[PDB]
């Protein structure tokens, strides 16, 4: 569903 926000992937 959502895109990653812990690192700038």
């Amino acid at each position, epitope marked *: *569903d*959502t*895109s*990653q*926000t*812990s*690192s*700038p*992937s």
Partner: antibody
Amino acid sequence: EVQLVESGGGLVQPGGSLRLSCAASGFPFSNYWMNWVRQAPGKGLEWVGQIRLKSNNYATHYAESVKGRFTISRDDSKNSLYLQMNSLKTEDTAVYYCTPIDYWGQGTTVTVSS
Amino acid sequence: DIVMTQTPLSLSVTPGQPASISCKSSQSLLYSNGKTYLNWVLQKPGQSPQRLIYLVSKLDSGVPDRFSGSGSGTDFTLKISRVEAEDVGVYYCVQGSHFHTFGQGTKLEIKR
């Protein structure tokens, strides 16, 4: 449901090797940088190594304390993450988490002893 | 490498009262894409870690609004406005601007 499930933890001799695996569901795995993080008994969290995307050529990088001994790999077709651990030491004893940092599972426990 | 300096190492807070945790980074966490990758995770006693805060100030789902995150560059703060019993555990900051590293952890107990 987001799920991350580690396996392959166990007891192994100092100097032995072990290979951990990890399956994931419920998020776009193939668009996510994937990590191993560990926690030695009774201590903090420690990033071990990272693997980036296909469009990054699956670039990998490692904590200085495991560099040259561990290898992270992935397989986006299986939504899987792997850690090959060679030349294991006593201080590699930990719970090992397969994580993008956004999401976490239960972990698999690695004990390095004689 | 970016070293994360978290203080205090422990907090003992009466419910109703606030808690504050500092995380400082040895270099800027400002990424080249204009975003700042500072995250806070909570590891509740006997549980796996779980993220609470991402991109400095944003709350993950299910996180009470008593939780807030602030800061920029090298300086960040987690605030809990009115501690409740469920807040107990070890908090860690974790930067994602240069791979990942974690704060040393802040153990929160309830004062009674």
